[PDB]
Write an enzyme that holds these catalytic residues in place. Structure first.
Site, PDB file in Angstrom:
ATOM      1  N   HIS A 260       0.851  -1.230   0.000  1.00  0.00           N
ATOM      2  CA  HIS A 260       0.000   0.000   0.000  1.00  0.00           C
ATOM      3  C   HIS A 260       0.873   1.261   0.000  1.00  0.00           C
ATOM      4  CE1 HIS A 260      -3.144  -2.880   0.852  1.00  0.00           C
ATOM      5  NE2 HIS A 260      -2.454  -3.245   1.958  1.00  0.00           N
TER       6      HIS A 260
ATOM      7  N   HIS B  79       5.122   7.076   6.781  1.00  0.00           N
ATOM      8  CA  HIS B  79       4.845   6.608   5.410  1.00  0.00           C
ATOM      9  C   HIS B  79       4.331   7.804   4.617  1.00  0.00           C
ATOM     10  CE1 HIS B  79       1.071   6.114   7.567  1.00  0.00           C
ATOM     11  NE2 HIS B  79       0.536   6.495   6.394  1.00  0.00           N
TER      12      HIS B  79
ATOM     13  N   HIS C 146       1.603   9.097   1.210  1.00  0.00           N
ATOM     14  CA  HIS C 146       0.593   8.871   0.151  1.00  0.00           C
ATOM     15  C   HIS C 146       0.956   9.812  -0.987  1.00  0.00           C
ATOM     16  CE1 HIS C 146      -1.907   6.824   3.239  1.00  0.00           C
ATOM     17  NE2 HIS C 146      -1.275   7.714   4.035  1.00  0.00           N
TER      18      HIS C 146
ATOM     19  N   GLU D  16      -3.953  13.306   1.018  1.00  0.00           N
ATOM     20  CA  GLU D  16      -5.211  12.726   1.554  1.00  0.00           C
ATOM     21  C   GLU D  16      -6.046  13.884   2.101  1.00  0.00           C
ATOM     22  OE1 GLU D  16      -4.024   9.118   3.978  1.00  0.00           O
ATOM     23  OE2 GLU D  16      -4.911   8.347   2.146  1.00  0.00           O
TER      24      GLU D  16
ATOM     25  N   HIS E 196       2.878  11.047   6.775  1.00  0.00           N
ATOM     26  CA  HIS E 196       2.207  10.712   8.056  1.00  0.00           C
ATOM     27  C   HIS E 196       3.249  10.195   9.033  1.00  0.00           C
ATOM     28  CE1 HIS E 196      -1.852  10.343   5.796  1.00  0.00           C
ATOM     29  NE2 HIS E 196      -1.498  11.603   6.074  1.00  0.00           N
TER      30      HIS E 196
ATOM     31  N   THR F  10      -6.523   6.269   7.699  1.00  0.00           N
ATOM     32  CA  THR F  10      -7.017   6.537   6.324  1.00  0.00           C
ATOM     33  C   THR F  10      -6.954   5.263   5.480  1.00  0.00           C
ATOM     34  OG1 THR F  10      -4.902   7.229   5.555  1.00  0.00           O
ATOM     35  CG2 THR F  10      -6.360   8.992   6.383  1.00  0.00           C
TER      36      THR F  10
END
Ligand SMILES: NS(=O)(=O)c1ccc(NC(=S)NCCCOc2ccccc2)cc1
Ligand SMILES: [Zn+2]
Length: 258
Positions: free
Chosen positions: A62, A92, A94, A104, A117, A196
């Protein structure tokens, strides 16, 4: 048929396995800068990352996680809206297929190229597993990335991604200093929300820094060469690993700043 970010397993499907996906305090959200209220009673945010110990970087299929040693109070988030001490466990990102998306959280509907994050758990609950079961179990520090000048303190991370191309691959990642990833200002918005990703647990105090960090086109390009699939499977580029903004419902976003 595991949850993911594709046409058939993406965020609009998650509620089927994780009903809380439609709950009262889901993340991320749009931050309406004109509606967020200055709260003059929000203490300054305290980030103590000098003794931080990174161990490992993992492609979990992911995102990539930089994992830290959280068996002692070495890297902690305190103050701001938080009561007590939250230990860094991992960070991590996104990110998008293009620089115009990837974040996000949004700011007046604006999407950033990526979102960092930094994940911390409340020491009062003893481990990460027990903290996610609590309404105040986690504090996630969200930092927006925009494309311009390179972030020098990110480059160590960008350079090891070759070694964790596919789901399940991990590399030793000691002596990485997360203070390299912070912006100058610690001004923030805060609101109660959720993980999330599945299981979407409503256990997070979100702290989103107003000030984004700059990364270079070549830095984000290396995020986009990562794979969601495992080794010797059809190659699907790890891009657009972001959940869109969720209904704000019965929540106020407070700002640390006038
Ligand atoms: N993107 S985010 O910052 O909102 C974020 C998303 C997922 C996680 N999650 C981590 S590190 N553990 C894996 C999943 C949760 O764990 C569990 C562990 C045990 C039981 C149940 C759940 C953390 C932050
Ligand atoms: Zn995240």
């Amino acid at each position: 048929h595991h949850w993911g970010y594709g046409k058939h397993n993406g965020p609009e499907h998650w509620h089927k396995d994780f009903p809380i996906a439609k709950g009262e305090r889901q993340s991320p959200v749009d931050i309406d800068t004109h509606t967020a209220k200055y709260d003059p009673s929000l203490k300054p945010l305290s980030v103590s990352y000098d003794q931080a110990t990174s161990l490992r970087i993992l492609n979990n299929g992911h995102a990539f996680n930089v994992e830290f040693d959280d068996s002692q109070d070495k890297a902690v988030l305190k103050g701001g809206p938080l009561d007590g001490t939250y230990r860094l466990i991992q960070f991590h990102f996104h990110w998008g297929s293009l620089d115009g998306q990837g974040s996000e959280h949004t700011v007046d509907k604006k999407k950033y190229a990526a979102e960092l994050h930094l994940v911390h758990w409340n020491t009062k609950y003893g481990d990460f597993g027990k903290a996610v079961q609590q309404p105040d179990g986690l504090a996630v520090l969200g930092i927006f990335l925009k494309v311009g000048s390179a972030k020098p303190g990110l480059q160590k991370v960008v350079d090891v991604l070759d070694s964790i191309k596919t789901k399940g691959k991990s590399a030793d990642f000691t002596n990485f200093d997360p203070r390299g990833l912070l912006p100058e200002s610690l001004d923030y918005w805060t609101y109660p929300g959720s993980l999330t990703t599945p299981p979407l647990l409503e256990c997070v105090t979100w702290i989103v820094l107003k000030e984004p960090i700059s990364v270079s086109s070549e830095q984000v390009l290396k995020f986009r060469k990562l794979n969601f699939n495992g080794e010797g499977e059809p190659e699907e580029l790890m891009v657009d690993n972001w959940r869109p903004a969720q209904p704000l419902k019965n929540r106020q976003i407070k700002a640390s700043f006038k």
